[PDB]
Each structure stands twice: as structure tokens, then as C-alpha cells.
Amino acid sequence: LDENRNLVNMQGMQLTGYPATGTPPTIQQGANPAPITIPNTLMAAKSTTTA
Amino acid sequence: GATAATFSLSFLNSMQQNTGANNIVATNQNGYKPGDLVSYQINNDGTVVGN
Amino acid sequence: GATAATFSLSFLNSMQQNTGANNIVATNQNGYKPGDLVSYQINNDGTVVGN
């Protein structure tokens, strides 16, 4: 992980994968591949709907 | 001063067969306070999961 | 007796989701102190940067 916080090998190649979208987050297998990054931001609070 | 939570409570899989004394065995909810980043890992399925 | 210093602070993109305690997650200023030419490097992009 570099200062940009990306999955990078020792040469400078950006690892690609299916982006995780939706609420709650989930991985869709029909989307175009996107670079996989690990943000430092925290997830927003969730309003309870199902118990 | 926050918006009230509009949630639905379902008592799924409830059985009355005189099971010892009154008690609970399961509780499922989708409510959690936000947290800070602790660790990151990748499972054998390739999906990146953070804790 | 130096000249007066003024600066505009931006607090945008700040969330209050009750994530436990209080802690600063980002800090930055553009007012760099004067520096001395340490060295220079050449990166693969073709540019030259003096540090």
C-alpha cells in the first residue's frame, strides 16, 4: 500500500477487481473491474430497519 | 434531535413447547455505531474484507 | 515584530456520527517554511523534482 492507499505491487501496477457498491456494500460480478483501494474514512451510521 | 428509527420487529422461528424457563436464544439487528480502521485482510475467495 | 499572519480554515466534509471519542483525522497547511535544497531525484515519468 502506497501513500495513495492502493493495492500496488513492487513495480507500480494497480490491482484491479470488481468494485463493491450498494447499501449494504456488496460485490457485483457484472461490473467493470476497478482498482481496489482501502479508504481511511469511516462508514456512516446505519438506521435500523429489520430486526 | 435525531430522526426516529422506523424499524420492524419480527419474532421469526418462535416455538412454544415448554422449553425449560422463559429465555432468549437469538437476536439479529443491523444497528451499529461507526468505528475506526483496525486491520485489513483478504480471504481465499479473493474478496477483500476489512475489520 | 513580524508581519501579521492570516489564514482561512476550511471545516467542510466533517461528519458527526457519534464514533465514540473525539480525535482529529486530518490536518494540513499550505504555508511552508523556507527550505534548503537537499537533493534531487528523477522518476520514471520524466520529471525532475528538487527536495
Side-chain angles (χ1 to χ4, degrees):
Chain A
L1 270 61
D2 44 354
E3 112 299 281
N4 199 14
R5 298 299 306 271
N6 307 332
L7 265 302
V8 184
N9 54 7
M10 306 303 107
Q11 290 76 350
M13 300 294 100
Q14 305 176 1
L15 180 61
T16 68
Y18 290 159
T21 61
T23 56
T26 176
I27 313 174
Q28 61 285 350
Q29 283 66 20
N32 189 277
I36 297 181
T37 69
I38 305 182
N40 189 30
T41 62
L42 67 159
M43 289 187 168
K46 185 62 173 299
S47 179
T48 305
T49 312
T50 304
Chain B
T3 61
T6 62
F7 52 90
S8 61
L9 176 54
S10 181
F11 292 88
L12 191 58
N13 197 21
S14 180
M15 177 63 62
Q16 177 179 161
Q17 291 184 355
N18 189 15
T19 307
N22 298 327
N23 47 17
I24 63 175
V25 73
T27 299
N28 293 94
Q29 66 285 341
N30 51 14
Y32 50 88
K33 291 170 56 182
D36 59 334
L37 179 57
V38 176
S39 58
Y40 52 94
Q41 69 178 3
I42 307 178
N43 53 28
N44 65 289
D45 297 356
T47 70
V48 288
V49 175
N51 302 337
Chain C
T3 59
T6 178
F7 47 90
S8 62
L9 180 61
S10 63
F11 198 64
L12 60 94
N13 198 21
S14 178
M15 299 74 64
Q16 181 185 358
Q17 302 171 351
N18 187 20
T19 168
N22 311 336
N23 45 7
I24 300 95
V25 303
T27 169
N28 172 31
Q29 80 294 341
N30 68 334
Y32 58 91
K33 58 179 178 299
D36 45 358
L37 179 55
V38 180
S39 55
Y40 48 85
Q41 53 84 18
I42 297 180
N43 31 6
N44 61 269
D45 61 357
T47 63
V48 54
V49 168
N51 186 16

